[PDB]
């Protein structure tokens, strides 16, 4: 319609409880790859707890969405759908 939105999906497989998925609604200009950090403490009882990880975007493996990137990341990472998998280094 007049406004457009893109969706993102990440999967962190580590933590005291560890997790394996992560799906959140993204708007055309919303940088929510960082919502996982707020999700960590909120989901640190069932899913993952430590977001100190390396994130890789795209099923084929091409773009990486780790924390070294800046806030305006999806404006550049969310062109298509956003799929990532997170590996906690610590």
UniProtKB/Swiss-Prot annotation:
Subunit text: Interacts with SAMD9.
Function, as annotated: Probable guanine nucleotide exchange factor. Putative effector of Ras and/or Rap. Associates with the GTP-bound form of Rap 1A and H-Ras in vitro.
Gene of this entry: Rgl2
All copies of domain Ras-associating, residue ranges: 4-90
Taxonomy, superkingdom: Eukaryota
Protein name, UniProt field: Ral guanine nucleotide dissociation stimulator-like 2
């Amino acid at each position: 319609g007049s406004s457009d939105c893109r969706i993102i999906r990440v999967q962190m497989e580590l933590g005291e409880d560890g997790s394996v998925y992560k799906s959140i609604l993204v708007t055309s200009q919303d940088k929510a790859p960082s919502v996982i950090s707020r999700v960590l403490k909120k989901n640190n009882r069932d899913s993952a707890v430590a977001s100190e990880f390396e994130l890789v975007q795209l099923l084929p493996g091409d773009r990486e969405l780790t924390i070294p990137h800046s806030a305006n990341v999806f404006y550049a990472m969310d062109g298509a759908s956003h799929d990532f998998l997170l590996r906690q280094r610590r």
